[PDB]
Amino acid sequence: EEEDAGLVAEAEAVAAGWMLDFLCLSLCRAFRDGRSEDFRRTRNSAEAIIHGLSSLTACQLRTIYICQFLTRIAAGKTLDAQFENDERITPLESALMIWGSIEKEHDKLHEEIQNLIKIQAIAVCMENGNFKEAEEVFERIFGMPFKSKLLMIISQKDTFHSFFQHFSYNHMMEKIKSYVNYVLSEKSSTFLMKAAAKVVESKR
Amino acid sequence: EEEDAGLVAEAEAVAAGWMLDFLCLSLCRAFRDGRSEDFRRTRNSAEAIIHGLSSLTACQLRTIYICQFLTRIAAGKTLDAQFENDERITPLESALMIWGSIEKEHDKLHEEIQNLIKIQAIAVCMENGNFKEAEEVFERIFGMPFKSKLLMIISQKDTFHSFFQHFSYNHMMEKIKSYVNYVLSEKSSTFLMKAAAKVVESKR
Ligand SMILES: CCNC(=O)Nc1cc(C)on1
Numbered sequence: 001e002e003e004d005a006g007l008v009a010e011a012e013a014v015a016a017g018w019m020l021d022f023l024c025l026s027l028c029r030a031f032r033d034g035r036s037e038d039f040r041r042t043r044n045s046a047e048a049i050i051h052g053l054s055s056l057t058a059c060q061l062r063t064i065y066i067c068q069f070l071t072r073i074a075a076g077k078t079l080d081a082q083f084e085n086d087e088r089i090t091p092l093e094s095a096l097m098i099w100g101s102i103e104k105e106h107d108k109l110h111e112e113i114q115n116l117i118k119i120q121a122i123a124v125c126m127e128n129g130n131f132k133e134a135e136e137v138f139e140r141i142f143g144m145p146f147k148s149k150l151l152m153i154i155s156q157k158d159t160f161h162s163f164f165q166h167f168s169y170n171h172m173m174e175k176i177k178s179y180v181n182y183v184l185s186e187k188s189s190t191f192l193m194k195a196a197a198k199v200v201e202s203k204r
Numbered sequence: 205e206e207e208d209a210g211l212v213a214e215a216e217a218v219a220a221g222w223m224l225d226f227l228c229l230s231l232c233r234a235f236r237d238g239r240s241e242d243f244r245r246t247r248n249s250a251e252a253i254i255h256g257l258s259s260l261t262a263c264q265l266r267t268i269y270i271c272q273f274l275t276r277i278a279a280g281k282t283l284d285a286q287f288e289n290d291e292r293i294t295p296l297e298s299a300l301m302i303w304g305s306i307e308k309e310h311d312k313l314h315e316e317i318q319n320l321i322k323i324q325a326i327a328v329c330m331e332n333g334n335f336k337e338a339e340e341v342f343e344r345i346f347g348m349p350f351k352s353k354l355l356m357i358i359s360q361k362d363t364f365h366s367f368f369q370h371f372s373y374n375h376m377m378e379k380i381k382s383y384v385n386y387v388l389s390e391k392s393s394t395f396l397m398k399a400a401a402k403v404v405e406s407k408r
């Protein structure tokens with residue numbers, strides 16, 4: 001009776017792990033497709049399953065990081081959203097912190113995404129008229145040539161500067177979607193999705 | 205590409221259906237064991253998965269009703285909780301409405317649970333000093349001998365009446381747990397639980 005309760009709890013943890021991978025895959029897919037409402041509802045389902053999980057494997061932690069990363073990128077223009085205990089950290093700064101924590105390859109795409117997030121973390125502050133906040137995000141991020149141009153743009157209050165059009169929010173989203181495509185191909189073979197795809201195929 | 209999106213959405217619906225049955229089973233188990241915190245977190249996970257489901261089978265609707273029923277029974281003493289658009293309906297009245305809607309056998313246990321919920325819907329109002337609310341719940345529920353004693357108890361403001369000890373809140377919970385045991389045996393063979401149990405067993 002006591003050992004049965006233990007086996008049940010172990011079975012619940014296995015199922016929660018399969019649910020986390022499936023929800024990450026659905027979240028990645030909605031982000032790639034720009035299905036905003038499906039992304040919001042999938043994010044709510046992922047947050048709840050995560051609260052029901054205790055011990056995490058390195059793989060499950062990377063899966064959660066990916067979910068948290070896309071959540072912050074989707075809210076990158078919502079400066080009112082507080083993702084950290086320190087209320088001064090903006091959503092793109094929180095996404096940058098997670099991007100540098102994921103156990104992943106630091107290839108060319110990784111650094112390009114990192115640098116696009118840094119430029120946009122400042123740019124979103126400038127477009128909202130938050131010039132003093134843009135300087136504060138700058139000090140938190142850069143602590144030379146790229147750094148020098150950004151400080152010049154902040155001091156000139158050049159909200160719609162041409163530099164922000166070359167390294168745009170759209171460009172950041174497109175590069176992030178390329179990475180999301182790689183995560184989609186890696187997680188398409190997870191237990192729940194494979195089994196659900198086989199039922200659908202068998203009905204055709 | 206368009207047909208692939210359709211097949212993916214169909215696979216997501218199959219997986220959401222398997223997740224709903226698993227979460228109902230975990231919710232039933234936590235309610236039976238009195239694991240209050242596990243019940244709260246499982247209820248949050250079940251509500252999110254339900255919002256991601258559109259077309260529902262008669263079986264999936266009964267599964268949701270069961271989840272909603274246990275949620276209202278668990279909050280039966282929280283008179284501040286509003287489970288209906290009409291703010292006057294108390295949690296036990298909302299549980300009674302769902303109990304009479306489930307496509308299930310109306311056996312002796314069914315009517316005993318129904319009658320225990322009616323007595324307790326009034327009793328919880330009396331114990332909180334809400335005597336006028338107790339009369340209003342009475343009018344909503346009974347619209348003779350059982351009805352007559354209850355009206356007499358309400359008019360006498362007999363909060364700790366002996367009748368409420370014979371047909372107690374504990375007695376209602378115990379009878380509801382007997383029904384929950386039947387739901388547990390029926391849903392233990394659902395896809396996610398069976399597959400998760402087999403992985404646990406194979407590791408022993
Ligand atoms: C800081 C509170 N918000 C979040 O952590 N959001 C998340 C996390 C995951 C996962 O998805 N949204």
Ligand SMILES: CCNC(=O)Nc1cc(C)on1
Pocket residue numbers: 247250251254268271272275286287288
């Ligand atoms: C009225 C809003 N609250 C609920 O419907 N609660 C539920 C529903 C399910 C399922 O679990 N809790």
